[PDB]
Design an enzyme around this catalytic site. Sequence first.
Site, PDB file in Angstrom:
ATOM      1  CG  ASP A 148       5.644  16.556   6.646  1.00 60.21           C
ATOM      2  OD1 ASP A 148       5.070  17.618   5.915  1.00 60.21           O
ATOM      3  OD2 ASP A 148       5.948  15.356   6.115  1.00 60.21           O
ATOM      4  CB  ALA A 199       6.703   1.711  -2.657  1.00 60.11           C
ATOM      5  CB  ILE A 252      -1.218   0.040   1.113  1.00 58.94           C
ATOM      6  CG1 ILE A 252      -0.227  -0.047   2.539  1.00 58.94           C
ATOM      7  CG2 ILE A 252      -2.043  -1.139   1.076  1.00 58.94           C
ATOM      8  CD1 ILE A 252      -1.238   0.088   3.612  1.00 58.94           C
ATOM      9  CE  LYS A 263       8.754   3.969   7.298  1.00 57.50           C
ATOM     10  NZ  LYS A 263       9.125   5.197   7.993  1.00 57.50           N
ATOM     11  NE  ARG A 286       3.087  15.887   2.670  1.00 62.72           N
ATOM     12  CZ  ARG A 286       2.918  17.146   2.732  1.00 62.72           C
ATOM     13  NH1 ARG A 286       1.662  17.510   2.122  1.00 62.72           N
ATOM     14  NH2 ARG A 286       3.716  18.000   3.312  1.00 62.72           N
ATOM     15  CG  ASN A 287       2.363  13.194   6.973  1.00 62.15           C
ATOM     16  OD1 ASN A 287       2.589  12.028   6.411  1.00 62.15           O
ATOM     17  ND2 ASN A 287       3.233  14.083   6.784  1.00 62.15           N
ATOM     18  CG  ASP A 321       5.675  11.497   8.698  1.00 61.15           C
ATOM     19  OD1 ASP A 321       6.651  10.724   9.057  1.00 61.15           O
ATOM     20  OD2 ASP A 321       5.604  12.076   7.686  1.00 61.15           O
ATOM     21  N   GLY A 375      12.054   0.436   2.168  1.00 64.67           N
ATOM     22  CA  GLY A 375      11.304  -0.191   2.319  1.00 64.67           C
ATOM     23  C   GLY A 375       9.851  -0.045   1.856  1.00 64.67           C
ATOM     24  CD  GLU A 376       9.305  -2.773  -0.218  1.00 62.87           C
ATOM     25  OE1 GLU A 376       9.185  -3.840   0.523  1.00 62.87           O
ATOM     26  OE2 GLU A 376      10.424  -2.231  -0.581  1.00 62.87           O
TER      27      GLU A 376
HETATM   28  C1  LIG Z   1       0.971   8.355   5.942  1.00 62.41           C
HETATM   29  O1  LIG Z   1       1.136   7.105   6.474  1.00 62.41           O
HETATM   30  C2  LIG Z   1       2.331   6.433   6.314  1.00 62.41           C
HETATM   31  C3  LIG Z   1       3.372   7.135   5.666  1.00 62.41           C
HETATM   32  C4  LIG Z   1       4.643   6.803   5.422  1.00 62.41           C
HETATM   33  C5  LIG Z   1       4.954   5.351   5.512  1.00 62.41           C
HETATM   34  C6  LIG Z   1       3.774   4.551   6.114  1.00 62.41           C
HETATM   35  C7  LIG Z   1       2.535   5.291   6.416  1.00 62.41           C
HETATM   36  N1  LIG Z   1       1.442   4.350   6.880  1.00 62.41           N
HETATM   37  C8  LIG Z   1       1.268   3.846   8.409  1.00 62.41           C
HETATM   38  C9  LIG Z   1       2.514   4.259   9.226  1.00 62.41           C
HETATM   39  C10 LIG Z   1       2.748   5.476   9.659  1.00 62.41           C
HETATM   40  C11 LIG Z   1       3.606   5.677  10.425  1.00 62.41           C
HETATM   41  O2  LIG Z   1       4.159   7.219  10.692  1.00 62.41           O
HETATM   42  C12 LIG Z   1       4.349   4.631  10.982  1.00 62.41           C
HETATM   43  C13 LIG Z   1       4.115   3.282  10.891  1.00 62.41           C
HETATM   44  C14 LIG Z   1       3.271   3.079   9.840  1.00 62.41           C
HETATM   45  C15 LIG Z   1       2.643   1.681   9.360  1.00 62.41           C
HETATM   46  C16 LIG Z   1      -0.022   3.306   8.288  1.00 62.41           C
HETATM   47  N2  LIG Z   1      -0.634   3.455   6.958  1.00 62.41           N
HETATM   48  C17 LIG Z   1      -1.698   2.865   6.438  1.00 62.41           C
HETATM   49  C18 LIG Z   1      -2.952   2.481   6.656  1.00 62.41           C
HETATM   50  O3  LIG Z   1      -3.116   1.854   7.782  1.00 62.41           O
HETATM   51  N3  LIG Z   1      -3.777   2.233   5.398  1.00 62.41           N
HETATM   52  C19 LIG Z   1      -3.538   2.542   4.179  1.00 62.41           C
HETATM   53  O4  LIG Z   1      -4.203   2.516   3.313  1.00 62.41           O
HETATM   54  N4  LIG Z   1      -2.441   3.386   4.140  1.00 62.41           N
HETATM   55  C20 LIG Z   1      -1.952   4.036   2.681  1.00 62.41           C
HETATM   56  C21 LIG Z   1      -1.427   3.662   5.222  1.00 62.41           C
HETATM   57  N5  LIG Z   1      -0.243   4.260   5.118  1.00 62.41           N
HETATM   58  C22 LIG Z   1       0.377   4.139   6.383  1.00 62.41           C
END
Ligand SMILES: COc1ccccc1-n1c(-c2cc(O)ccc2C)cn2c3c(=O)[nH]c(=O)n(C)c3nc12
Length: 287
Positions: A138, A24, A22, A45, A142-143, A156, A28-29
Amino acid sequence: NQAVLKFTTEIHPSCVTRQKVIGAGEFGEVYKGMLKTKEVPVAIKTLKAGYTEKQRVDFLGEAGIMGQFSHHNIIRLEGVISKYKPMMIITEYMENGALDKFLREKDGEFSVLQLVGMLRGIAAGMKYLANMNYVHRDLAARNILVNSNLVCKVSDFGLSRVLEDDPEATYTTSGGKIPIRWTAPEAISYRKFTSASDVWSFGIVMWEVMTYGERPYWELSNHEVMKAINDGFRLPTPMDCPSAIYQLMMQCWQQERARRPKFADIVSILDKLIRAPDSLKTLADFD
Ligand SMILES: COc1ccccc1-n1c(-c2cc(O)ccc2C)cn2c3c(=O)[nH]c(=O)n(C)c3nc12
């Protein structure tokens, strides 16, 4: 990180199932998956082998910070994989993804009350961060992540990694990497990041929400944005925007940091508007 990580559950790799990409990045992804505890869906993540010392400290440092928070509007940390590779940060799963993309794909599908409710949740999460002495730096749609109850949660976290990793953050002429059109003037001009510059960013998030994810300042360059703000121009009112909501975001964009509302004020105001929903029927003139 070894002190803050005591608040984190070390998860054994067997307990985690990655299922769909979901997000990238370079090292890492981000995955949707499931976490053995019954099974709960999670977001995951990763940090692949080959990472540097600084990358490990930054990556695990985000989990150390997230593990110190417990709030409805802050993404919940389930745990980490730090003993094995790839390393992982495992959070609650937000079914509807990032708020900016969500709104751009759902254009016009929500009521004003639902949109304002989103903003109240974001402001409550931000009030909590600020009073925990955490400056986000930030804050942007988007966050913010959105779940199937339409609850918005701030994500974030970290130190230098937050602005390093965000491609919206660009290098200024003076050497700082910042997301210009979300950032308060004092943070751009002399690197003064506080909860009050986060309030400026929140005002931009209010505009992102009420416009269903319009890109702030449209095609203005970063320098043209900085020049417009310094000359007194502000984003115009969104379509179908309650006058009270536009007035509130305009207060978030006061040049003088001390004149901006605190997040405590923002939450209070949004709560009163929501609990007397006729207050949102009066709309600011759209040009
Ligand atoms: C904005 O969310 C992210 C941004 C960069 C990387 C991962 C995510 N990120 C996170 C996350 C956010 C964190 O701060 C730390 C750890 C994680 C796993 C959760 N989710 C989700 C999620 O629960 N569901 C989604 O559809 N997406 C696109 C997500 N993107 C993220």
